[PDB]
Amino acid sequence: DEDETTALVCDNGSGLVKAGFAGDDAPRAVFPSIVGRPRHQGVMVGMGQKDSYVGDEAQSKRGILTLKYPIEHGIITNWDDMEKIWHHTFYNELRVAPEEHPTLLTEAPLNPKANREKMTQIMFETFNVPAMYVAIQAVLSLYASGRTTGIVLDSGDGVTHNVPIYEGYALPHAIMRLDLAGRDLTDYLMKILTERGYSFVTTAEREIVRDIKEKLCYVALDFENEMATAASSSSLEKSYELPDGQVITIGNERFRCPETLFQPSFIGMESAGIHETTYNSIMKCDIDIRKDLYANNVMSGGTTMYPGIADRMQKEITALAPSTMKIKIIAPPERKYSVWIGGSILASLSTFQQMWITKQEYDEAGPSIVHRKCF
Amino acid sequence: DEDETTALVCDNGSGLVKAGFAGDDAPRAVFPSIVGRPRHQGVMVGMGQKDSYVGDEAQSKRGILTLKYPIEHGIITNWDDMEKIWHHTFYNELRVAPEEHPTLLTEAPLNPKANREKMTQIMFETFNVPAMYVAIQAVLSLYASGRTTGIVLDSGDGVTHNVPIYEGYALPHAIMRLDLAGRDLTDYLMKILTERGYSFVTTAEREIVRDIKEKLCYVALDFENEMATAASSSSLEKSYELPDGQVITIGNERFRCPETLFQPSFIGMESAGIHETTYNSIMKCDIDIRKDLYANNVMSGGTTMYPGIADRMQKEITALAPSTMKIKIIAPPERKYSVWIGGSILASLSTFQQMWITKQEYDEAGPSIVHRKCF
């Protein structure tokens, strides 16, 4: 097993569990944050066929399951299913006892504090961790950059952040939160695939559409001329073989899916877009911070592996920011993992080991200790 | 006798009783599901000459009997004659007391529930079985395959099934039932034998025509070129010596009989055929099931011992299914018995012994207990 007391870094954003140990390059366990459950009856007698499938096994059996994400927009909705996800995380995937390891959880800013508080209650009461710490996810995404100055966009499966930090000091009044992320892009892609002719409605078919979004989507630097480019010829069409047979061929849907991220009116969501929430987070900072946020604009979570989103990102923030400013969009190709990687850095720091919310301090101050020790 | 409480596996599809014990290779008793009855008067005084002949004895005396099948399209029509068939099954052929043995009956999906209910009432009230269980026949046909994933076609004497199962879970919305089977093929062969010149009209002559169908029929992989092949030369003609004398010589009737199974318009039956009800049962399943149904397409009851029906079957399902799918038609030569063999597996399972509908639970809940314990 693990012969030491190495800290656990568990990172469930809203749609993908990535967990592992501190002082480590990559997360050891990366699996979908789903719990599946059979929706019709078992007939082969003597089969096993447990009435819950968590993680990657659920996508192995998703044709006979109703898949259900226990965490939506960064908020944990099903608590017993999230306990299934954590139980599978420690005991099956990462294959370790939580009693021996301090654990580092992550969440978004501007979240309900009962998420953080009940997450601490489940970590100490159910899994009996010795220490525990919730961490703001974009902050850790700046720990992976090796920077102490920068504004961080990450955009996981349920939430996007823009946390600005200058010289180690965060600017929590200048913080942002938009609930437009990759599951919303998956749903919008599923809608416009219904526009082309392909009907995906099941949760398993939603997982297929999510795969189409990951394999086969880019961001379109200039959306109008890319739109007319797809309207002119079929040079942007691309085929995807569905599981078990039929192939599909998608055109302008390839880049209309993450244009919703730059233009949230497509999914009917009144917002300013990703590029304007970055600029508005920078303009909420003080005057002497802003060029150090322009040159350090870290873009480091999931849903940013769309090809060209750093080009669209710089190309649009440059149009908002004044001239003679140096707009550098940092898009480090190890992102989708850098919230975990910065979790690994922070949990492996030696200054940090008196910042763990420990037990006998949880037992002393109840579950509200998180609002005086964590942030 | 039997020194234990071994379960009985009785399997009357619609035209052939095959019964025996659980934990057993082959059924111990295989005999025709007929009850014969004399249609003219007895003249030799001091003869015996009982006024009912059940099973194989009826085919020994079919020249002076009117043979009558008590079970038609998988539905039991004569109940007193089916009680003759069961009485002969337990007490004469299998030669055992039903009071000592739990019994496993089989029927088709999508059957009248009074068949299942009255079959349970006759098993407990008349034969006094300690336990009883009806079982879906194609499901058991997948128990004999050693598989828990596959779509099952069986096609007994009165009914054909296509039950799809994935990872132990059946898909009862994707289930099928066509009432085109081997007795209908026997009647159609009897009609086109009347077209050639040979008149078979009696029930005993119907049994002769059924023998001609079993000995002397194949399925014709390409029906049009086989049809013109028989029209070109006499290399497909084959002779059959009838009982007591005259020989016959059949040509294109050798393969026009089971082409009705692939093309039900010949018997005037509006349907899609065997090959399209398999593909339609697969397309009614979810998207992530289908290649595991394509590679596991079990073809395992009676009326499938036509030579080449797995070749016609794969050759036609491949034309319906998309390319880059692996169509495997499983045709295990122990079929015509594999519904019984999977009955033997299921009744010999140790998980199954609390799934028997037992007496004192029949007496508690009436005969409708079958619709909460069986399926």
Binding site: G197, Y198, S199, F200, L242, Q246, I248 | I287
Partner: peptide, 7 residues
């Protein structure tokens, strides 16, 4: 894809 009727 999908359906019947749908692609």
């Amino acid at each position: 894809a999908x359906x019947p009727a749908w692609x």
